[PDB]
C-alpha cells in the first residue's frame, strides 16, 4: 500500500506541473491577440452605423 501511494504522489505532481505550463502559455498568447485587436480598433476613423 505504501509503494502504491508513493507512485500516486509522483503521478499527481507530474499532472499538476504540465497543466501549469500549458495554461501559462495559453494565457500569454490570449493576451497577445487581445492587444492586437484593441490596437487596430483605435485606427478606425469612421465607424459603422446600424
Amino acid at each position: 500500500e505504501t509503494i502504491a501511494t508513493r507512485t500516486f504522489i509522483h503521478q499527481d505532481f507530474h499532472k499538476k506541473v504540465t497543466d501549469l505550463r500549458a495554461r501559462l502559455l495559453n494565457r500569454t498568447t490570449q493576451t497577445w491577440y487581445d492587444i492586437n485587436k484593441e490596437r487596430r480598433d483605435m485606427d478606425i476613423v469612421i465607424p459603422d452605423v446600424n
Binding site: 500500500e1 502504491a4 507512485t7 500516486f8 503521478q11 499527481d12 499532472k15
Partner: protein
C-alpha cells in the same frame, strides 16, 4: 423483437486499449449519513483497497481532483439551494426549519457533518474527468464517488444532494454535439432525465424497475417534450431479471441507439442496487452480468466517463467495481481476493464473486418483445439530416 439467449463468459477484445484515468480522494470514505442509513461512502474506499492489492494500479493513473466551487454548482442548481447546502449543519438545523421543509430535507436525505465537502468531492471528480476527456488526454475516466443521479435542480431527492452527472455532461457538451447517458441503476435516473428532457443533445437511456417502486416515473410512453421528443428512452422491467435476460434486452437497445443517435461521448452510471443480494433493489444480476454492460459499452470505442451510483451491500459494490475497473484495463482478474485491510466483509469463502439467488423472473418474452418494439419505433426519429458532414463521431 427479442429472442432470449444464454449468457456468454465476459471477454476483453485486444484490438483497442484505453488510457484509464482513475479519480480518488482519500477523504471521501470519511463521511457518514447517520446511524442506520443505507448510504455508506466507505464502500468507495473499500474498492480502492482491492485496486491497490490486486496490482491494478500499475496500468492507470490515479488523481485527486480539486473540489468543485459554489459557482460551478450553480450551473445547474439554484442559489438558494446551494447556499442552504453550504450553511446547514447537524447543529443549527433548528434555524432552517423552513428551508429543510422546502428543499426536501430530513428523513430520506438528512444533513450530516461534511455534506458540502462530500458534494464538492463528487462534483469535482466528475467535472475534472469531463475536462480531461475534452483535452484528449484519457479515453476512460472513472469516478466512483459520483453518480448521485436523483438530485433535483432545487431539491434533495433519494440519498442524493448534488447532481454531478449534470455538471459533467455540461462540461462534455462544450466540445461535443451529442452526448449519450446510460443508467443501469435499479431506480429510474430521473434527475438527469428531468434536466435534459427538452433537448436533443443529451440522450438519456434508463433500464429500471417500474412498479410500486421509487421514484415513480419513467414509463414506456415518457419520451421527451418539445424538441426533445424521442430523446428519452425508458426500459421498465419486472423483478427477478437475470444475466441472460438482461443481456439480451440491454445489447440491442444500446446498439440501435449507437447506430441511430451516433453519440460521441458516453456517460455510464454503474449503480449497484441492481445486484442479487442488495438491500433495496430487486434484480437478480450476477457480477459477470452486471459487468458485461460495461464491457459492451466499451467495445464501441468512444470517450467513456464511468461513474458510481447505488449499491447498498458494500461487499458487492466493492467487488463489482474492482472487477469492472480491471475489465476497463483489458484484464480479467482472479477470483481469490488478496489479503487487504478489509479481509472481512467477504464471508464466507473470500472470493471475487457475486452470487445470484433462485427467486423467480417475472419478465417473459411477450412483455419484453412489446417494450422493445415500442422503443425501436420511438427510436427512428432521432437521426442526423443527410447534409451534415461529421467528424466520424
Amino acid at each position: 423483437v427479442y429472442e432470449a439467449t444464454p449468457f456468454d463468459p465476459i471477454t476483453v477484445k485486444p484490438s483497442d486499449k484505453r488510457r484509464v484515468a482513475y479519480f480518488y480522494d482519500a477523504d471521501v470514505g470519511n463521511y457518514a449519513y447517520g446511524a442506520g442509513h443505507p448510504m455508506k461512502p466507505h464502500r468507495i474506499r473499500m474498492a480502492h483497497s482491492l485496486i491497490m492489492n490486486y496490482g491494478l494500479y500499475k496500468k492507470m493513473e490515479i488523481y485527486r481532483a480539486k473540489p468543485a466551487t459554489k459557482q460551478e454548482m450553480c450551473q445547474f442548481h439554484t442559489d438558494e439551494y446551494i447556499d442552504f447546502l453550504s450553511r446547514v449543519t447537524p447543529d443549527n438545523l433548528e434555524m432552517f426549519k423552513r428551508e429543510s421543509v422546502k428543499f426536501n430535507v430530513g428523513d430520506d436525505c438528512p444533513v450530516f457533518d461534511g455534506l458540502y465537502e462530500y458534494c464538492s468531492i463528487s462534483g469535482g471528480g466528475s467535472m475534472e474527468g469531463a475536462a480531461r476527456l475534452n483535452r484528449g488526454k484519457c479515453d476512460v475516466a472513472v469516478n466512483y464517488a459520483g453518480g448521485l443521479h436523483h438530485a433535483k435542480k432545487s431539491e434533495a431527492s433519494g440519498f442524493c444532494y448534488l447532481n454531478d452527472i449534470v455538471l459533467g455532461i455540461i462540461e462534455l457538451l462544450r466540445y461535443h454535439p451529442r452526448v449519450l447517458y446510460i443508467d443501469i441503476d435499479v431506480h429510474h435516473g430521473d434527475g438527469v432525465e428531468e434536466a435534459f428532457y427538452t433537448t436533443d443533445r443529451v440522450m438519456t437511456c434508463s433500464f429500471h424497475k417500474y412498479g410500486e417502486f421509487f421514484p415513480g416515473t419513467g414509463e414506456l410512453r415518457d419520451i421527451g417534450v418539445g424538441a426533445g421528443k424521442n430523446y428519452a428512452v425508458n426500459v421498465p422491467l419486472r423483478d427477478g431479471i437475470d444475466d441472460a435476460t438482461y443481456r439480451s434486452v440491454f445489447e440491442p437497445v444500446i446498439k440501435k441507439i449507437m447506430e441511430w443517435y451516433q453519440p460521441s461521448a458516453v456517460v455510464l452510471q454503474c449503480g449497484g442496487d441492481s445486484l442479487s443480494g442488495d438491500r433495496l433493489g430487486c434484480f437478480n444480476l450476477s457480477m459477470e452480468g452486471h459487468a458485461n454492460c460495461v464491457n459492451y459499452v466499451k467495445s464501441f470505442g468512444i470517450p467513456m466517463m464511468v461513474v458510481g451510483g447505488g449499491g447498498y451491500t458494500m461487499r458487492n459494490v466493492a467487488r463489482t467495481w474492482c472487477f469492472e475497473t480491471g475489465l476497463l484495463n483489458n484484464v480479467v482478474l482472479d477470483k481469490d481476493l488478496p489479503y487487504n485491510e478489509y479481509y472481512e466483509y467477504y464471508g464466507p469463502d473470500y472470493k471475487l464473486s457475486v452470487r445470484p439467488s433462485n427467486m423467480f423472473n417475472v419478465n417473459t418474452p411477450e412483455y419484453l418483445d412489446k417494450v422493445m418494439t415500442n422503443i425501436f419505433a420511438n427510436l427512428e426519429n432521432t437521426k442526423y439530416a443527410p447534409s451534415v458532414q461529421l467528424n466520424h463521431t
